[PDB]
């Protein structure tokens, strides 16, 4: 499935 983005940007 994957783990969600925890950073300020998607880069």
């Amino acid at each position, epitope marked *: *499935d*994957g*783990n*969600p*983005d*925890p*950073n*300020a*940007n*998607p*880069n």
Partner: antibody
Amino acid sequence: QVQLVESGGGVVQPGRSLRLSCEASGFTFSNFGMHWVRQTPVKGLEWVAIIWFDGSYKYYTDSVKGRFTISRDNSKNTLYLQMNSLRAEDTAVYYCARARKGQRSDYYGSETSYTFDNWGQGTLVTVSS
Amino acid sequence: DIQMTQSPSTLSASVGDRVTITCRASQSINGWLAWYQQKPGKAPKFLIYKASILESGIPSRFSGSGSGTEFTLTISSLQPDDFATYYCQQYSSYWTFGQGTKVEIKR
């Protein structure tokens, strides 16, 4: 150079508390999610907790829920782990680590997942009666 | 949790050897597999992500392949600083690690 410097470990009896700190330099700390991970000789590497870049969300591994709190102070570039109600089995080296897009940097879309790249030097936590 | 298993747990090798380490998952993890290197008393170091992408600055003798439940890390020609423990990690659902493979000096 990315740098994560930890402190706060020690030897305590069960039921007591410790607070770990992890101070970041060399990158924009407030842009990154952060993790705690721990290591023992018998059980290996175990993920502990994650916190969002601005502290707006966080979650934990089952065995520490209700006892550990992850927090951060983006004005001091510091990540914390508050460890209450310590148990002998929490004995480990504790690492902070920086969240990392686990995919080509220029790719954007549904097939992305996140892991973590740079680890701190570790601090030792020993819990024993 | 997704269970990760590596093989073998200890691998003996000589400088110049081609060395391959395998990592299996208890269910498909797509390509969300990362590899870390650790030496005694030091923090793990990020090597490879999405099974086959080298982290910037890692030497090109390292490479990775695999999908689904079966992955490998290969060092094409082992150097003296490559004797270490290597860990796989799935990041498809939370984060779980293999038990580590120690690469030791053969004699």
